[PDB]
Symmetry: C2
Subunit: 210 residues, 2 copies
């Protein structure tokens, strides 16, 4: 049964073509998941599963769509009782030998207990954006006063266990409107060190976002 | 009134001497704040102000002491109705012209509303998440499987407004035992994009920790 899903807007024809070309070339089975966009489908799904996220001003409707797409794929994993599911965004470039990781699950089956709670990053480890410049407050002694953020950690390529699929559905359903952040900031920053939640990194990575 | 406080365990002689040497050299006024240690004083303070933190297994008594030291200095700021207070740990190294930032507060008074909620980091910013090597899960196709960790953002050098002193006392009093993390993980990671809470970074920084 199919484990590799590529999150793609249904009308993103060129991106879908570049994905099909690369996956076909390395004989890696996959399906598209039709990414949520500003729509009634997104609005109703947010209301059905994440009304806490529907009310969150601090997320753009694009960021809300991204989170809903990943969420529904965590649901699919539970519903089909898959051991794991592997999720990509449609702007990824596969490395040579990605098929050694992405065609077969045996290397996962001999390393992992799928009831345990883990994510394995397949995408390159990304340094967050941290210093934003601002003009409101003037510099002093030729040093700037920047704003601190931690943004864009990347959700474009990871394996998630059934255990972590359950864990993350519950987490995003649990969080108050004030606690909501973009999916990447929770999955790959805030929840790191949490009790029983492990994130692994394939080094070197087997794909990267364009 | 003195605005610069260096959090230091009273018995850390060499650290206190390195602090005194650097602050004297640049003519920067400061006082030591006697850091909380595993003691009855820490236990009672945790019970008095942060009973949520007293119960938190996921913090070491050292991390709980660090948080209590910062908390009591936020309290001092409110109680004395200071516009701001500047907090250091005793393992800090001052850069060349730190005294141009740390001797006087005028450059702060002409830039900031002290009732607004801001922290200005004086200390260098380091990466939130790092790759650790691990042995539990074996490599495949000669690629490692590293684990993501985050341990130290640094609370060794920041200016806090009275607004942010109120905000952070409330926050640490509010959080459930389950929600408690080390002070640095909340102040400079989890709270970053929060509604009224701004963290500024002096770039380039004017100090750095030895840690």
């Amino acid at each position: 049964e199919n484990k590799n899903f590529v999150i793609s807007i249904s009308t993103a024809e060129q991106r879908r073509n570049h994905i099909i070309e690369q996956f076909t070339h390395q004989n890696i089975p996959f399906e598209f998941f039709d990414a949520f966009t500003p729509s009634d489908k997104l609005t109703d799904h947010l209301q059905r599963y994440l009304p806490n996220v529907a009310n969150a001003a601090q997320l753009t409707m694009g960021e809300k769509g991204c989170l809903m797409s990943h969420f529904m794929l965590w649901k699919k994993c539970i519903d089909e009782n898959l051991d794991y599911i592997t999720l990509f965004e449609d702007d990824i470039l596969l490395g040579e030998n990605a098929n050694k990781f992405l065609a077969e699950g045996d290397w996962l089956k001999v390393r992992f207990n799928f009831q345990e709670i883990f994510v394995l990053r397949l995408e390159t480890f990304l340094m967050p954006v941290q210093l934003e410049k601002q003009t409101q407050i003037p510099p002093f002694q030729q040093r700037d006063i920047d704003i601190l953020t931690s943004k864009h950690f990347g959700t474009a390529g990871y394996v998630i266990s059934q255990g972590a699929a359950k864990y993350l559905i519950a987490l995003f359903e649990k969080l108050t409107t004030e606690e909501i952040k973009p999916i990447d900031e929770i999955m790959f920053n805030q929840q790191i060190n949490a009790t029983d939640y492990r994130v692994y990194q394939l080094n070197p990575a087997i794909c990267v976002q364009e």
